[PDB]
Design a protein around this ligand. Structure first.
Ligand SMILES: *[C@@H]1O[C@H](CO)[C@@H](O[C@@H]2O[C@H](CO)[C@@H](O)[C@H](O)[C@H]2NC(C)=O)[C@H](O)[C@H]1NC(C)=O
Ligand SMILES: [Zn+2]
Ligand SMILES: [Zn+2]
Lengths: 647, 647
């Protein structure tokens, strides 16, 4: 039998008993006072312990106001807990709906043949913080501070971009509590709870789980698709999307959140970009006096061009093609749940959420293209000087350009992919500079050593991503670090005859230098896994170029004044770049909400942060290091290859 | 005001008028006759034309039986059409629910202030075809033939694997009509229409859109996760997921479907696998008399091993690492919507849906490992014979092994990825055999030519996938085909001096041979895009090895009887392999339902189809072709390199 109850507007908690096989229909008449009133109706099952063995849905509640509707099926079962009380939000009535009256209908049923007591909570949350995103003339930023969020009273906004003349929009949520919450956004026509065919395929709803920070970027193309959005903030009752351990799953914890809503206008960062190019083009004047003037004073390739390793480009270009496919097929809402930027220092350009991280890689392209051009132009000598490193200096400029393609692609969506490919091209540039100085006095160094160098770099960075969740990953690196460095110490003595002068102290310097690094990242959690292999290559590259320079003065060979300047600029730029690299703090083993909570502001001009200066000083470091090795043996330009000392 | 109506069980169509701001509550009392009765309640808006300008949801209908519930929000808007009549299925009551009576409650509302006429259709579809998947003792396959499917009466099954002792399960749907339909499957506890947090991330519902065939594989690990499933078949009212063109979006078309339910037991295919290994190990006896006996009769590497191109392995191993990540992160339900197998010839092993397509690539691994071992073992001569191709014959065996890794990885999930990587390693094996015969009389062929060969293969197959949707993609291939072949014809005359004897007819044979192929795939839609570049490499490889053999008799050099046998086995095996390759019929430009409709049965032993014999005869073809080039110049073993003719 069906029982109809008339419920007043004053009644906020409704306690009734659902007799066996009885249906309760509760009605609340709605008038103009309910326009833009976001209402939450929740149901409680009194004496939840009585229904422990009863499986399935014990109580069914359906709430409707004629415009929106939802279903409350209790218990609502989560992976960790079962809740015998839950509610949902009813999209408010609008002035179009309103003499004539709307009405709020709640229907309660149960398949159980026993009597069931329940409680209905009708919560209102409106009149502010809903209808807040209305921007007055000449205003671009609005702020809500310390808005309280409970499991009973969620937060919810409505954004009409057609009404507010909004082209791009940014939402930021600040919280100091580490309490799990959810940021749900959908188009106004869509429903949070209503599933659509091909859910994962066609999905316009974004659910960002956060603790201390969360960011929403409504791109200009997304605003035009829907023209209006609904933003909701809920407390996650299960902390799985934000924490790995199960801790006090059942709780009643309030959460204070601060909001910032930006009305973004498309802009060109002409001042930070021009000042970045002036800073990057200034050190290229070192090429002018020594390298370029020789090209002025002077005025089979197909055998070298078809045997040159061009499959070293494929690891980077096949990653770029896959990351662009994964980016253009993703929906506008999926790009916010998937890509993890540092939104305190993320400046957008179109759909790109961090343009500063993409354009700051232009020093690698600029310098890499100069390394290729100058090496090709300055190869015009067979009896005097050291052997010309023309094709290895072109390979260093290729990986300098590839590092700009690999990093600009990582910064489009920084998600936890199998092959990271932000740093790895730096590790090849550093190993190629050691291969150059290894053979420069023996022979003309071959770019064929890039294959074993790149395969070892690509295989090692995939081996760290695969075992990153494990506890012994830093030991897997250390045993490879010893095997790789113990092989180089054995390759040196076999080549140089194990002389006590040069070979005996090369081994101790590299054994103590690399063991001091292993003790730092193995016995101490000094660096992150993404930074461990990159710091080890830079230190070994610097240690070898310092050994090569220390051996040069020990053999009574003078280092030119220019090579000492470029050598000190190489040490200085690698230390400044390594200081900004040390501040990345990106671990893909932690939860998505902990990866979102990390926010470090911009250091310079509102555009450059610690990461963008690592891109800028990593290319300066690669520039000055390339200019040092190219100038260090200029005093030997008139010495016969037979007289030249070999180390 | 709320109006309560009592509706009898005889009333199948309910026509009422929803007055302005009135709520109708309709009740149907349910008794034991409704156990396992899957019911569909649909609502119609009479005079749909009256509500054309009214936006949003005009009518709201909520149906519940105490155990299940749903919401009908009319009009249900699809991308192409708006439907003013739709319904959903109510999960049936069970004997646990049943003196005591259940009841079916329908609630009707409208936000409109005008009167609205509606019709309620209560359709029953049960007592057979629901509770049909009960398997009697000793029965493993059940079949339903020509089950009629309409938009008003959908199909729906219930599978209890705990009750039926089912470990693995396969569902197949056969239809001869090209009418769009949907195959929806979910766990019994889950709901088709109830959305879950992180929908795309945590999704156990599979929606397969099909026209003529659809397949479901319940793996052993999925059966254990849920233990019971609900299978539904609906007619897609919008044909977007199955057709590209909008055609008669509104229709009332019946569809006849045939079902086949298999109770699969885990099995080892010992007979097809052993007979495949006997067939693959038999032709290895050609290595025994000539190659191996020399190794018996006879009884700097680090310079070649560190300069050997090992970055040619990275394109294939970095694709395998990405396809395994995309496979282990996918849910059990997503692997059926994403991977497109030929399920008429797909034999499963564990989670792998096509084990026959993975294990038939073992001839590439077997032969590739023999190519590596024999080449390394038979390099022990500098004045007699042709130049030893030791490191290029190892590179051919590396890409022979890589083709087994690249194809076994493609067959785990054949989805439309950016880089296909099923054939491309064959194109390098065919180009490496031309590089071998190009230089074998000039010098020792270098594996360094693999870089430009692999980069061109990888770049070309990505260029076809990128432009596959376009209409001019076969012209993009043809201009690259002419540029590549016109470069080889120019490289031949520059090397051989443009002699009328050998160079003048090499150009005409390769210009007419490659233009005859272009006319076939450009002016005719002969091959698929996946097969175009692979057929062009095989024909040029065969044309060159035939030119090399025709030049050999023109220079009065005898071809040994064994090399003529292996040469005829190379032509025969490339024609048999090319006959099974021609039958792939995989186009990623067509709809997913058209990619699912393709089903070609197994040819041999219930295990081998056209594709699996392409894997088997593609390795025989690569075996016999490798044995031909290794034996063709054995008559020159006692001829000085100065006397040896060069062509
Ligand atoms: C968001 O705001 C816009 C603009 O204020 C709304 O657009 C108007 O919609 C009414 C119907 O309700 C039309 O009669 C007007 O022509 C529209 N005005 C303009 C300037 O286009 C839009 O409907 C609103 N959408 C939501 C979800 O509230
Ligand atoms: Zn970076
Ligand atoms: Zn294949």
């Amino acid at each position: 039998s069906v029982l109809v109850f008339e419920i007043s507007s004053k009644m906020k908690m409704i306690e009734k008993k659902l007799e066996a096989n009885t249906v309760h229909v509760l009605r609340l008449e709605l008038d103009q006072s309910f326009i833009l009133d976001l209402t939450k109706v929740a149901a409680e099952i009194v004496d939840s312990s009585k229904y422990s063995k009863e499986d399935g849905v014990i109580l069914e509640v359906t709430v409707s106001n004629g415009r929106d509707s939802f279903l409350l099926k209790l218990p609502t079962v989560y992976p960790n807990l079962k809740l015998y009380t839950d509610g949902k939000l009813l999209n408010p009535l609008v002035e179009q709906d309103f003499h004539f009256h709307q009405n709020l209908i709640v229907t309660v049923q149960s398949r159980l043949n026993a009597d069931i007591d329940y409680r209905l909570h009708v919560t209102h949350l409106d009149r502010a913080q809903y209808d807040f995103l209305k921007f007055k003339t000449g205003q671009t930023t609005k702020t809500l501070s310390n808005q309280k969020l409970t499991f009973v009273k969620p937060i919810g906004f409505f954004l009409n971009c057609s009404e507010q003349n909004i082209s791009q929009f940014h939402v930021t949520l600040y919280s100091e509590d580490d309490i799990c919450a959810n940021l749900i956004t959908v188009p106004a026509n869509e429903s949070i709870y209503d599933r659509s065919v091909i859910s994962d395929k066609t999905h316009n709803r974004r659910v960002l789980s956060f603790t201390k920070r969360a960011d929403i970027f409504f791109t200009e193309t997304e605003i035009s698709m829907f023209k209006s959005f609904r933003i909701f903030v809920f407390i996650a009752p299960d902390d799985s999307g934000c924490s790995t351990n199960t801790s006090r799953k059942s709780f009643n914890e309030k959460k204070k959140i601060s909001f910032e809503f930006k009305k973004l206008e498309n802009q060109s960062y002409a001042v930070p970009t021009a000042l970045m190019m002036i800073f990057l083009t200034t050190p290229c004047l070192l090429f002018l006096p020594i390298v370029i003037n020789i090209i002025k004073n002077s005025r089979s390739l197909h055998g070298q061009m078809l045997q040159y390793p061009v499959a070293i480009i494929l690891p980077v270009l096949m990653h770029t093609a896959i990351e662009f496919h994964k980016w253009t097929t993703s929906t506008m809402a999926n790009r916010d749940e998937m890509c993890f930027h540092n939104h305190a220092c993320a400046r957008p350009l179109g759909e790109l959420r961090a343009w500063n991280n993409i354009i700051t890689n232009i020093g690698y392209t600029l310098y890499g293209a100069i390394f290729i051009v100058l090496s090709i132009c300055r190869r015009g000598s067979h009896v005097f000087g050291t052997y010309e490193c023309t094709l290895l200096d072109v390979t260093i400029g290729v990986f300098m350009v590839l590092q700009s393609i690999a990093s600009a692609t990582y910064h489009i969506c920084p998600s936890d992919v199998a092959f990271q490919f932000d740093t790895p091209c730096i590790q090849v540039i550093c190993g190629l500079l050691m291969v150059r100085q290894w053979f420069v006095r023996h022979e003309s160094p071959s770019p064929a050593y890039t294959n074993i160098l790149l395969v070892g770099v690509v295989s090692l960075n995939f081996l760290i991503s695969a075992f990153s969740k494990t506890s012994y990953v830093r030991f897997i690196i250390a045993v490879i670090h010893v095997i790789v460095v113990g092989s180089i110490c054995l390759a040196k003595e076999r080549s140089l005859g194990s002389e006590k002068l040069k070979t005996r102290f090369f081994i101790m310097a590299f054994s103590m230098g690399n063991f001091a690094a292993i003790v730092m990242y193995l016995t101490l959690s000094a660096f992150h896994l993404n930074q461990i292999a990159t710091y080890c290559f830079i230190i070994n590259c610097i240690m070898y170029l310092m050994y090569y320079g220390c051996m040069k003065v020990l053999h009574s060979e003078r280092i030119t004044s220019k090579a000492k300047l470029c050598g000190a600029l190489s040490l200085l730029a690698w230390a400044v770049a390594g200081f900004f690299f040390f501040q990345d703090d990106t671990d893909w083993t932690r939860s998505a909400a902990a990866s979102r909570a990390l926010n470090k502001p911009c250091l310079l001009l509102g555009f450059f942060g610690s990461h963008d200066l690592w891109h800028i000083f990593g290319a300066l470091a690669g520039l000055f290091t390339f200019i040092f090795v190219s100038f260090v043996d200029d005093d030997l330009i008139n010495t016969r290859k037979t007289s030249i000392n070999i180390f």
